[PDB]
Ligand binder design. Structure first.
Ligand code: NAD
Ligand code: NAD
Ligand code: NAD
Ligand code: NAD
Ligand code: NA
Ligand code: NA
Lengths: 261, 259, 260, 259
């Protein structure tokens, strides 16, 4: 086996669906004990589905914006497992709003989940990784903010720029303690968030929006939750023991093309 | 004159001192009517010193984290000047804290000023730049977050990564309305913020810390408020009318050196 | 005056037309003594047109891929001027060819002009800049290679990646001697090269190709030779005395847009 | 098994030692049939060492700057194997020279191997990967040129900038034909090239130079040929089927540290 995560303990935020679910599945397939962290009531069934496929999956229903409850959850995971090796911060919200139409509710919702939620998760995990003398943190950014941007994404792009900068500073601070910190910057991925955005843009024909996005990618398809989980698994593994402080673009050359398609 | 800002109106946050003061001075020297926006009591003397050098300088003492008061201030500037051409977001705080020692007060202070303050400033200015059919926004990021990082800067680097991303999204959103938005990413610059950080590292001999920083820069000096103001003036000017959505590193090759 | 280049001496390669001509004009308007370097016999007329507008413009017809003729030309410029302050490497070729169809002649033509030409120009200039303890080098890269790429541009993108890397290493090497080195990475610019490419892609309606390119830029226009010259003038000036080792994208947010 | 390269054919340039040897070993451990391409007299023994560990390794002693001989070698590999899935371009030279001391021989040596050698390798492989309906190309760039640079590396950094740009253009051109192209940008790695540079800087005590470089890395060690091979294996595998056109920095945060 080139990848062996047996006896490693991972927490994945956003584990109930989308890329977090993909990351939890790949870590579990590699032999990790995985905890799905999600506010969604679907998270228990998500962990159940993985146990039925022979995987060591567990859940905690908790809101990552509640620092006290999240800290209590991670302390409990570390206590009952004896260690914490891997954190994937995949929980996020993708709300769009034109800059002049932004209200305090929208600003707060996107930044609390995307920024403070990743902050709270890292802050609860790092102490347990220091006890272990070993940790891997994989943050989810976006191409939106650090690389490219469209109109209508100022708060989301601000939130993912924050993750980009936070990732580099956390990597720098804990390199000497063998905690490696990296970000995945996904392009157009086939998730519930993307399907919802497609329905918002064209309620009559959401599939036609998905088809147009796929045609603008040089690889001619959206990324999958498996593609995202595969890169998170690589970064969590002994195959990536020298790779830290980097933001890796996973986009099928969507941001590479000089003219679109 | 290759640069002529005569008849243009500029708002500069952080205008009392440091790079904001440099930006306001260079815009004013190029002929702009400049307003220094700053919470510091030093802002009155800063505007007075520019008027004494023959420059068209004004101030509003206001906290950029107070969105209602900031909006009132910018609406008043636009009403009395008849236009708003240029916004420079230089106001910021440089507080360092080890990640595990961060408390809610530190997190909130740095993000409120560095992120929400730049947000509030852009949100109050953009309506006036749309009326003007023309606007230039220069945000101050840092090399810290987007390019490099040291231990003890998680909140600051998060705040400057936020500015990096926000800059690109605002540029994308308003390019069609001729509002150009760019960020300056300074390296080690000789400002009150840097002098305060030097005194924190070695209270007995702050100058020795400044000297060590200068020796680590390939150009062998810190940047100046003039260097920063010169780049802000370029970005605000007709010399930069096709340049938008970019984060320009102004660092004397500090981030370039390999070893 | 915020910019004063009065009696600084500048060499601009590719000075006969396109962005090189824009850079030479802006430096000369700021008061520089400018030499247009070009292989084209049109370079004499280009310098004449600037002198007729009251500018201090001169030409040398020389091939930048001939190291030994270019070195003789720059030595002559420095000897007759007493100094050399500014070098703009704007000469380039923009030939496209699908990777499997590349032949040695292609590969050589694009890399000799774009890479070895910039190499030869910097190598002949730097000693004269060191004599007066001051130099500014502005290299022309592209967004193509360092930032984005389309099919059919492997050799061009290779050449502009080379300029990107060379710019950073030359900046690092001479920072301590006050030679500042930066690159401009232009997007879609309105030059003779672009106009020729538009005519090639649609001889029936070249302007419609220019209009389609302009519509893909968030600012809704191509860049001009003036936009390019304006940034080179900034980088050559006392306004940019702390800025070195950087590659600046001048593209009206063409590479920023998530959807075109 | 998360990674299975069984029945895949890989060509690795620079396979005799250093990071090329690491890449060939990791691809072979994952089940690939690997051909070590190298001018070094060591290359036969390198392939023999892998066969002694039960791995499917072969060699061709050939100079990548000889386009006709390299093309003949790759044509022979594809004909005898029926396939070509993976190309790793690790062969390179690391010669340093101050800019004003560069001569035609130095310029030619570094650019012929680092640039034209990668070009010749890709040009010989791509036709076989199109027949295969599948290819993965991993080019070796450096942090030197695209990210950072020290004095004395103008030709090397030019060569690695060329690889950076060529990687992106080749990725763009072949994305639609399922050839994925990426670059690894290593930092300070423990290879014969690095050990040669260490011995050049201090012949009496090369290890002290290696120790100083390791101390400048936040992870406090040099990268290994295994670290490099592990990233090349990832990029060659089904785990990276949506990752193309990227230059990935593998450096233990060497380029990240501010001060
Ligand atoms: N989908 C894309 O194309 C795309 C592109 C760029 C980046 N991203 C980023 O990737 C990450 C994952 O996105 P996805 O598409 O899988 O999203 P998704 O909405 O499909 O899945 C998100 C998951 O996060 C959970 N979550 C949300 N808020 C939470 C909270 N407060 N507490 C706990 N769990 C919470 C949800 O319940 C859900 O299970 C996000 O950070 C997103 O911004 C998405
Ligand atoms: N000095 C450096 O080396 C350096 C390096 C990189 C980035 N930066 C950034 O550049 C910008 C300018 O920094 P500087 O060194 O000039 O800082 P400074 O502290 O010297 O000047 C900052 C100014 O902003 C004002 N300000 C702060 N909070 C404010 C608020 N809430 N409302 C109104 N005004 C407020 C201060 O009163 C002061 O006049 C900042 O965003 C900083 O984070 C500085
Ligand atoms: N036009 C664009 O959209 C665009 C965008 C990206 C980058 N660029 C780059 O910017 C630079 C300038 O481009 P331009 O559009 O002004 O080009 P152009 O072809 O319109 O003008 C180029 C000039 O270079 C000169 N030149 C060419 N080969 C020479 C040689 N061997 N010796 C001396 N002079 C020589 C020509 O004679 C001519 O005057 C080039 O490096 C180009 O590749 C162009
Ligand atoms: N070692 C570092 O720290 C470092 C850092 C960044 C980039 N790199 C790059 O990574 C790659 C691998 O470097 P390394 O340190 O493993 O090098 P090395 O010198 O240890 O190994 C290089 C191998 O390439 C072979 N090779 C060289 N020229 C050849 C030619 N003309 N034809 C065929 N084979 C040839 C050599 O014989 C040798 O086996 C190179 O492209 C190098 O420039 C190295
Ligand atoms: Na694009
Ligand atoms: Na550095």
């Amino acid at each position: 086996h080139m990848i062996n995560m047996r006896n490693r303990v991972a927490i994945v935020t956003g584990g109930a669906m989308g890329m977090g679910n993909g990351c939890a599945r790949k870590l579990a397939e590699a032999g990790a004990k995985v905890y799905l962290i999600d506010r969604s009531n679907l998270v228990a069934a998500a962990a159940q589905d993985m146990r039925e496929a022979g995987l060591n999956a567990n859940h905690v229903q908790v809101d990552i914006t509640d620092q006290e409850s999240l800290t209590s959850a991670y302390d409990g995971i570390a206590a009952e497992s004896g260690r914490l090796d891997v954190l994937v911060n995949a929980a996020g919200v993708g709300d769009s709003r034109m800059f002049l139409d932004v209200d305090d509710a929208h600003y707060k919702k996107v930044i609390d989940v995307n920024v403070r939620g990743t902050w709270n998760s890292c802050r609860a995990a790092v102490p347990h990784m220091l006890s272990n003398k070993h940790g891997r943190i994989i943050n989810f950014g976006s191409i939106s903010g650090p690389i490219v941007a469209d109109p209508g994404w100022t708060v989301y792009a601000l939130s993912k720029g924050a993750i980009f900068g936070f990732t580099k500073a956390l990597a720098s601070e804990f390199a000497g303690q063998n905690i490696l910190v990296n970000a995945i910057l996904p392009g157009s991925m086939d998730t519930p968030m993307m399907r919802a955005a497609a329905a918002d843009t064209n309620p009559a024909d959401p599939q036609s929006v998905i088809d147009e996005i796929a045609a603008a990618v040089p690889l001619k398809r959206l990324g999958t939750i498996d593609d995202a989980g595969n890169l998170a698994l690589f970064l969590a593994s002994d195959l990536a023991s020298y790779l830290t402080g980097q933001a890796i673009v996973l986009d099928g050359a969507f941001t590479l093309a000089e003219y679109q398609s």
